[PDB]
Amino acid sequence: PMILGYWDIRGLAHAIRLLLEYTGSDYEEKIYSMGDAPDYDRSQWLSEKFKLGLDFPNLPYLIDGAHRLTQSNAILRYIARKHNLCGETEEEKIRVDVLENQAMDTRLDFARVCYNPDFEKLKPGFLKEIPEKMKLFSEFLGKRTWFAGDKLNYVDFLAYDVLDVYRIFEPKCLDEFPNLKDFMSRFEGLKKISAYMKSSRFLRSPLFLKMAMWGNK
Amino acid sequence: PMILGYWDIRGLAHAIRLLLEYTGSDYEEKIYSMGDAPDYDRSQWLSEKFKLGLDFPNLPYLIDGAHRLTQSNAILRYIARKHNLCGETEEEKIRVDVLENQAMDTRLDFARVCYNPDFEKLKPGFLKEIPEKMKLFSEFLGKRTWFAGDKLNYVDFLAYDVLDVYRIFEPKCLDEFPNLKDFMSRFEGLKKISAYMKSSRFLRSPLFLKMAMWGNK
Numbered sequence: 473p474m475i476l477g478y479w480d481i482r483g484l485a486h487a488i489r490l491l492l493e494y495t496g497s498d499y500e501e502k503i504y505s506m507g508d509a510p511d512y513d514r515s516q517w518l519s520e521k522f523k524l525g526l527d528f529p530n531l532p533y534l535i536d537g538a539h540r541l542t543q544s545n546a547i548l549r550y551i552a553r554k555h556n557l558c559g560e561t562e563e564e565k566i567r568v569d570v571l572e573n574q575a576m577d578t579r580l581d582f583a584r585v586c587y588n589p590d591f592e593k594l595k596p597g598f599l600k601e602i603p604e605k606m607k608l609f610s611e612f613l614g615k616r617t618w619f620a621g622d623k624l625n626y627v628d629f630l631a632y633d634v635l636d637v638y639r640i641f642e643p644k645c646l647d648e649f650p651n652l653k654d655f656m657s658r659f660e661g662l663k664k665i666s667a668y669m670k671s672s673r674f675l676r677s678p679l680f681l682k683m684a685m686w687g688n689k
Numbered sequence: 690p691m692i693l694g695y696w697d698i699r700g701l702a703h704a705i706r707l708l709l710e711y712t713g714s715d716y717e718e719k720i721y722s723m724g725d726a727p728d729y730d731r732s733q734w735l736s737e738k739f740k741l742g743l744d745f746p747n748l749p750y751l752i753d754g755a756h757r758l759t760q761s762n763a764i765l766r767y768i769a770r771k772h773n774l775c776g777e778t779e780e781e782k783i784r785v786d787v788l789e790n791q792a793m794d795t796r797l798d799f800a801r802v803c804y805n806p807d808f809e810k811l812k813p814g815f816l817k818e819i820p821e822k823m824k825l826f827s828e829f830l831g832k833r834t835w836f837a838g839d840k841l842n843y844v845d846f847l848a849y850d851v852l853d854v855y856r857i858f859e860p861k862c863l864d865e866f867p868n869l870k871d872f873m874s875r876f877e878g879l880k881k882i883s884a885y886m887k888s889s890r891f892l893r894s895p896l897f898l899k900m901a902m903w904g905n906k
């Protein structure tokens with residue numbers, strides 16, 4: 473089976489786990505646990521980081537037969553090619569690439585404040601940035617079924633993930649964008665996704681690592 | 690003709706400018722100038738930022754007919770798909786996706802230090818992290834003619850750009866890695882590339898924007 477290596481949190485592997493369940497992949501998780509504060513012991517991962525035959529050792533990683541991958545986006549793309557979840561036309565391909573890279577910039581905007589020791593002083597300023605972020609995503613989606621067009625694509629998993637994270641931090645953030653509320657519902661009720669979610673191996677939380685000031689659980 | 694919008698520096702646009710040149714694309718640059726300290730006035734861009742039809746307005750952007758793109762990586766892939774500059778085997782596509790994402794993370798590691806007011810204090814530690822980064826690139830390349838196989842790829846433009854920046858910062862950083870030196874010469878030897886590098890267009894500098902501690906001139 474395939475091995476998904478990541479920390480015992482949601483973070484960067486969540487859209488991957490989401491994809492791995494929708495696609496019917498057989499896979500298992502190599503969970504790395506992090507030591508409690510203050511030292512946040514990473515030695516469980518650091519001890520085998522350079523022992524896995526990874527070109528650029530990192531988390532998350534994925535092993536599939538002869539293929540050993542890092543970089544979360546590269547893994548998503550790998551799973552997508554094996555299981556018909558890329559864009560076909562040039563129009564979808566452009567939308568995929570722009571949204572894939574944009575999701576990561578949007579995720580890091582948010583990660584950078586929650587992981588900041590000064591999160592509480594920076595929290596009101598970031599909360600007022602969120603309406604325009606979400607509005608970009610609502611205008612991009614428009615009247616489409618999925619973000620790339622008619623068909624489910626791997627970027628939809630990225631989009632659901634980053635939107636989920638923002639709406640956990642700010643439960644009212646999608647309220648003036650009904651088309652994104654309908655997107656999240658439609659995604660959560662695919663069927664392999666509903667089954668995964670209302671199952672025990674669905675990792676609700678923590679959203680982030682232990683040293684984060686929010687969503688560390 | 691295609692329109693490439695960026696600041697009047699090297700920055701994130703550099704690999705796009707090379708690929709545009711190498712593919713013989715018909716292109717013009719919309720160059721935005723930024724004010725001097727202390728304001729670093731951005732009005733030349735903010736004047737138009739939201740009036741260009743961009744889904745996620747940003748720099749660099751590319752306007753090609755009806756297609757209006759942002760995200761430097763999406764722009765590179767858009768150009769590559771027009772000229773078959775992407776991998777064809779599943780092994781090549783894996784090497785492309787991993788290196789594309791790795792090159793941005795490595796670029797960002799460097800950009801963060803140079804733009805940090807505390808640059809001088811951070812410089813010693815960052816210098817000692819460079820040998821390990823280059824070793825990983827060196828062993829990834831191996832004896833291959835290019836990073837993805839025997840066929841030039843857009844990710845080669847990214848790897849040249851990021852490696853060029855690190856060797857501009859630390860001139861001895863490729864010394865103990867001969868295969869990376871051969872990669873850089875062979876890349877510069879490309880006829881359309883050398884001709885672009887030999888004309889007073891070539892913005893090898895400034896690496897970064899005016900407010901950077903290093904590479905601002």
Ligand SMILES: N[C@@H](CCC(=O)N[C@@H](CSCc1ccc([N+](=O)[O-])cc1)C(=O)NCC(=O)O)C(=O)O
Pocket residue numbers: 479483484521529530531532542543544545579580583681790794
């Ligand atoms: N660009 C890479 C990022 C890889 C990465 O940063 N992994 C970190 C995650 S914690 C830092 C982190 C937390 C949360 C976010 N985020 O935006 O959600 C980003 C980075 C790690 O655990 N180990 C890397 C190592 O061995 O040095 C990817 O997308 O896979």
Ligand SMILES: N[C@@H](CCC(=O)N[C@@H](CSCc1ccc([N+](=O)[O-])cc1)C(=O)NCC(=O)O)C(=O)O
Pocket residue numbers: 573577696700701746747748749759760761762796797800
């Ligand atoms: N992920 C996007 C990043 C786009 C971006 O941040 N552009 C900045 C570049 S300056 C900040 C910057 C400098 C250098 C790097 N780098 O890695 O070298 C990254 C970001 C800008 O000028 N305007 C965006 C805006 O108007 O909001 C991409 O790759 O295109």
Ligand code: NA
Pocket residue numbers: 556557623624
């Ligand atoms: Na499908």
Ligand code: NA
Pocket residue numbers: 735736738
């Ligand atoms: Na404006």
Ligand code: NA
Pocket residue numbers: 830831832833834835868
């Ligand atoms: Na080589």
